Amino acid sequence: MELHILEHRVRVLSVARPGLWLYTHPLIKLLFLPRRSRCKFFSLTETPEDYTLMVDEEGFKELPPSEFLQVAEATWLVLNVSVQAAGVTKIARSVIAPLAEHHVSVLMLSTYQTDFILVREQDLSVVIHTLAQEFDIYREVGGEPVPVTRTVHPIQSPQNRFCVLTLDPETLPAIATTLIDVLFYSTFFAFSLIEGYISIVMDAETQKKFPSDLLLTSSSGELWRMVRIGGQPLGFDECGIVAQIAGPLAAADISAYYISTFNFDHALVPEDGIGSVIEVLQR
Amino acid sequence: MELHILEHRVRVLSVARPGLWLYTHPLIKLLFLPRRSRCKFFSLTETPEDYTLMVDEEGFKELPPSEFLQVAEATWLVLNVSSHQAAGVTKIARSVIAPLAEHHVSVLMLSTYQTDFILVREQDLSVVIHTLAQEFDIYREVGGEPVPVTRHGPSPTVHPIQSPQNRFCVLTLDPETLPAIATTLIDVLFYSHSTPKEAASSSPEPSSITFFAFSLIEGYISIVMDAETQKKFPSDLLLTLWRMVRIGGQPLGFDECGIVAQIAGPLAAADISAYYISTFNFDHALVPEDGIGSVIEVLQR
Ligand SMILES: NC(=[NH2+])NCCC[C@H](N)C(=O)O
Ligand SMILES: NC(=[NH2+])NCCC[C@H](N)C(=O)O
C-alpha cells in the first residue's frame, strides 16, 4: 500500500574498537541527551569487527574525524513501508527483491518497531520507478506525507541467544550507567533511537546485567539466533545479498530481523527454527 | 584533638576545558563504574578553565598524558581532623593551617559535605608530624583502622580575590541514587555551557562562575553546585546557601605556602564558617551567603 521516504539523511560509519574511547563524548550525547543535538536517527551496533554507526546529518556533525573513523560513501535515504511476519520477511518480495533486481544496493535496519531500508540518494528515481507499481509513495516533509511527483555468501550461526527489546524513553536514564558499561567498558549488541523510539538487540547473558523491570517486549522469553552473512567484508555496492537470505525465509514463512553493519549482514531468526533456517539457506 | 593520616596516595591533575572530550571515557569510569577500578579517592572540580582531579594512584593510571593534561609534581597524603563557633577550615586555622604554613609545608584543601581534607606532599610528612604532634594525637589509617603514630615557590604574597554572585549548595547522595541521576550529572558536568574566563582585575564580582565539585571518597559522595542547578535533579534524591571567594590572579601553583592561612586566619578571628576547595590553578572559600559582605571587608584589610 504505502511507501514513505522518511525525512532522514543518513551517513554510515565504522569506529574501530581501539578508538571507541575517543567517541565517548559524542556518543553519550547522542544516546542520552536529546536536547543537546538535533539528531533524530541514531543506530549503534557493536560487532567483533567494529562499532557501526548510522546517524543523520546532524548526528554526523558531532563525530570528529580520526584515523579510527571510516565513513561509507554517499548519503542514504530511509524507506519505510506502511498479522505479518516479523522483520524483513514481510517486505522480502515487495521491497528487497525488486530493489535487488533493479541493482539498487540497500542497507537493512530492522528494529523492534519497524523495518528501515536504506538506499543511496543517487538511486531515488530508480527506487520510485521500481516500487511505484505496488506502493503509493510519499515523502515526509515537515512531519506530513507528500505524494511523490516528478554471489552466494557463506553463513554462520554462533550459539548466542538474542533478545529484541524496546524501552519506554522515560526510563532510559534508569538504564544509562549499565548501557554505558556494556557499550564502552566491557559479540553483537544493537541500540537504535529513531524518531524517539528505542530498539535494542542484546545477548540473553547481557540482558541479565540490566535492572529487572525496564526492558520491554511483547513476547517475554522469545529468543533469536543470529545468522551472520558474508566471508570478506561486503562493501556497499553488491546487490542481492539481503534478497538471497530474505527471499528463502519468506518462501518458508519464517520471521527474521535483519541488520546490516559496516562489514557484514545479520539475520535474527526464532531460536527453535535455526536448524530449518540453515537447511533452507543451503538450498 | 585527634589527627588522622588517611590511606590515600593522591595525584593532582588538570584537564584543560578544551581537552575534556579526550578524557570523557576515564572520567565516566571513575564517576560511575566502581567495579571497573580500584580507585577509592576521586575528586572532580569543574571550573571555567579546567577540570581539576585529585585521584589516588589507582585512579591516576586511567588518565593518559596529552597536551591538555597537567599533573602536579608531587604525591600527596591526606590529613583529616574530626572535631564536632565557625565550621569548616575556620576551625583548624590556628591549630593546623597556620602552623603548617609557618613551617613551610604547602597544602591543598578539599572540603566535602562530610569533612575537611588537608593534602600535603609526602616528602613533608615528617615536618607535618613534628609540627602537629604537640596539639594532636596522631593516627595513621592502616587497613581502615587507626594506628598511633609514635615515630621553589614564589615568596608568600597577598593574592587578589574575586566574589562571584551565584549561590552554592553543599549536598550528598545515597550511593544507590548515583545511577538514577547519572545522565543529569553527566549533562551538567560535561555538556553544558560555561562562563567565559574572567580575571579578578576586570571582574571583581562576576554575576556567575561555573563551579561544580564532585567527590567520591571511600564510597561517600559530596557535591557542591550552583543553587540554580539543583532544579535539574529531583528533590528527594539530593540530601541537604554559600557564596564563593575565589583566590588568585596568576595560577597559584603548589609550592607557595600561607595562602589558605591568609584566608582562614581572618575568618577565624571573625568567627565565619568557610568551606575551602583548592583547584589546580586557584583556591575557593565558600562562606555563608549572608556574611559575604563582612568576609570581603576582612579580606581586604
Ligand atoms: N555492508 C553491508 N552490510 N553490506 C551488505 C548490505 C546489503 C546489500 N547491499 C544488498 O543490497 O543486498
Ligand atoms: N593550586 C592551588 N590551589 N594552590 C594553592 C593551595 C594552597 C597553598 N599551597 C598553601 O599552602 O596555602
Side-chain angles (χ1 to χ4, degrees), chain A residues 1-100 102-149 151-169 171-278 280-283, chain B residues 1-34 36-37 39-66 68-90 92-175 177-301:
Chain A
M1 204 167 192
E2 291 192 8
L3 180 78
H4 287 257
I5 304 157
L6 299 192
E7 198 144 18
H8 312 292
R9 296 174 62 79
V10 164
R11 309 305 313 286
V12 179
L13 306 92
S14 178
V15 179
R17 172 167 287 104
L20 185 72
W21 65 272
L22 188 64
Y23 293 89
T24 302
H25 191 276
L27 289 169
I28 282 185
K29 174 195 292 183
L30 295 171
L31 288 160
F32 299 111
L33 309 172
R35 295 292 70 77
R36 298 291 192 186
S37 87
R38 297 200 283 115
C39 180
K40 286 182 215 248
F41 188 109
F42 175 72
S43 170
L44 163 56
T45 302
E46 176 190 349
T47 59
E49 291 88 16
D50 57 15
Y51 293 80
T52 300
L53 304 174
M54 307 188 318
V55 291
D56 65 16
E57 298 179 327
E58 283 300 305
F60 182 72
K61 294 183 192 166
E62 310 276 350
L63 306 172
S66 71
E67 69 271 22
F68 308 112
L69 180 71
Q70 304 174 53
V71 185
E73 284 187 76
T75 296
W76 299 72
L77 309 179
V78 185
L79 317 177
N80 188 61
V81 173
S82 299
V83 196
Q84 290 173 299
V88 74
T89 307
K90 60 186 168 298
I91 57 165
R93 295 199 83 168
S94 68
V95 175
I96 296 305
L99 292 183
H102 288 86
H103 313 284
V104 173
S105 187
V106 310
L107 288 173
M108 282 301 298
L109 185 63
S110 292
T111 69
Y112 185 99
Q113 289 80 16
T114 194
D115 304 282
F116 298 109
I117 315 98
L118 282 73
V119 294
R120 290 176 289 195
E121 182 174 28
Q122 61 205 46
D123 284 334
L124 184 59
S125 71
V126 174
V127 166
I128 294 176
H129 188 262
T130 296
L131 299 179
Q133 307 307 306
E134 180 160 8
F135 299 96
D136 290 324
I137 307 186
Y138 299 85
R139 312 199 55 164
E140 290 278 319
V141 183
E144 270 158 337
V146 175
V148 155
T149 66
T151 89
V152 180
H153 290 275
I155 62 173
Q156 70 186 30
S157 182
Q159 288 300 133
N160 307 75
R161 306 202 282 170
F162 289 97
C163 316
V164 180
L165 304 166
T166 183
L167 190 84
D168 169 15
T171 68
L172 180 61
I175 70 165
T177 55
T178 305
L179 185 56
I180 288 176
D181 192 53
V182 160
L183 284 174
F184 296 99
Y185 303 93
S186 290
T187 300
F188 185 93
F189 186 94
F191 179 95
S192 66
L193 169 56
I194 294 162
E195 300 174 36
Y197 291 96
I198 298 169
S199 174
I200 303 177
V201 179
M202 185 197 294
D203 206 297
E205 300 298 330
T206 304
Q207 177 176 36
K208 301 183 185 170
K209 298 180 181 187
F210 286 79
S212 296
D213 264 337
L214 301 178
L215 306 155
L216 309 172
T217 181
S218 47
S219 299
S220 148
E222 182 169 34
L223 301 178
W224 306 75
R225 290 275 309 258
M226 166 173 299
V227 178
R228 197 197 74 148
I229 300 130
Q232 301 263 39
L234 300 179
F236 306 91
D237 291 323
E238 183 183 346
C239 300
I241 298 178
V242 188
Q244 71 184 249
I245 305 304
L249 291 184
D253 196 18
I254 296 175
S255 295
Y257 295 91
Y258 202 109
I259 296 168
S260 301
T261 63
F262 202 85
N263 296 305
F264 296 98
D265 275 353
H266 317 258
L268 288 134
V269 300
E271 64 161 334
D272 300 312
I274 187 58
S276 65
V277 164
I278 301 294
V280 159
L281 291 182
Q282 298 165 169
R283 298 168 57 89
Chain B
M1 157 269 303
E2 295 186 355
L3 183 141
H4 286 245
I5 305 158
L6 303 185
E7 206 161 5
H8 309 291
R9 295 172 60 73
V10 166
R11 304 305 302 276
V12 176
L13 308 84
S14 175
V15 180
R17 177 168 291 282
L20 183 269
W21 70 295
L22 304 173
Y23 290 92
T24 298
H25 188 90
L27 293 175
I28 291 291
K29 183 192 302 195
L30 292 172
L31 284 162
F32 299 109
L33 305 176
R36 295 281 177 198
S37 182
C39 182
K40 314 189 329 285
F41 188 107
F42 177 69
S43 172
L44 170 53
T45 303
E46 178 189 17
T47 69
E49 62 274 1
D50 83 325
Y51 295 80
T52 293
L53 316 171
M54 295 177 190
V55 70
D56 67 11
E57 297 176 317
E58 285 294 325
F60 182 71
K61 308 168 180 177
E62 305 292 336
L63 305 150
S66 81
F68 307 92
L69 180 73
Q70 291 180 280
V71 183
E73 277 176 337
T75 298
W76 299 75
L77 303 181
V78 177
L79 314 176
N80 178 69
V81 174
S82 178
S83 178
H84 301 84
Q85 308 146 34
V89 189
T90 308
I92 54 168
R94 281 60 207 275
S95 59
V96 179
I97 302 307
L100 289 185
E102 286 161 4
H103 291 88
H104 305 287
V105 175
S106 181
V107 300
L108 294 164
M109 303 299 303
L110 183 63
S111 291
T112 68
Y113 181 96
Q114 286 78 21
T115 188
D116 305 295
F117 300 111
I118 309 99
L119 286 72
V120 299
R121 295 180 280 189
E122 74 181 329
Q123 58 266 41
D124 286 344
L125 180 58
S126 285
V127 171
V128 169
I129 289 171
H130 192 262
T131 299
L132 301 182
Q134 262 281 85
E135 172 144 19
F136 295 91
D137 281 322
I138 295 172
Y139 299 84
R140 178 160 225 163
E141 297 299 316
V142 183
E145 297 299 324
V147 176
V149 168
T150 61
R151 311 168 57 89
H152 298 100
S155 46
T157 62
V158 176
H159 292 265
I161 62 170
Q162 182 179 60
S163 182
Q165 306 293 290
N166 43 319
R167 298 157 69 165
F168 292 95
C169 58
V170 184
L171 322 171
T172 185
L173 282 142
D174 192 325
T177 308
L178 188 53
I181 66 154
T183 61
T184 308
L185 184 57
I186 285 170
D187 182 84
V188 168
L189 272 171
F190 300 134
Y191 295 86
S192 294
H193 298 105
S194 49
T195 54
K197 178 181 172 65
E198 294 183 336
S201 53
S202 58
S203 308
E205 315 181 276
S207 66
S208 177
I209 187 183
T210 296
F211 188 88
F212 190 109
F214 177 93
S215 62
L216 175 56
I217 298 166
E218 310 178 55
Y220 286 84
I221 295 168
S222 170
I223 295 182
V224 177
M225 69 168 75
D226 195 305
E228 297 296 310
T229 303
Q230 290 181 100
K231 322 178 190 293
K232 295 194 64 161
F233 304 83
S235 64
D236 313 323
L237 306 189
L238 300 187
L239 312 177
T240 60
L241 299 160
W242 301 78
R243 291 274 301 264
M244 172 190 290
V245 181
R246 169 173 253 206
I247 297 123
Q250 302 286 104
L252 294 183
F254 303 95
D255 293 85
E256 181 181 339
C257 305
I259 302 178
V260 189
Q262 73 189 231
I263 310 302
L267 295 192
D271 195 49
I272 296 173
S273 294
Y275 272 30
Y276 202 110
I277 296 171
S278 291
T279 64
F280 201 88
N281 301 297
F282 305 104
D283 274 348
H284 310 79
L286 290 291
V287 295
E289 69 173 331
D290 300 333
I292 185 59
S294 182
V295 165
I296 294 311
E297 186 279 348
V298 309
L299 295 181
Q300 283 176 353
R301 300 206 278 243

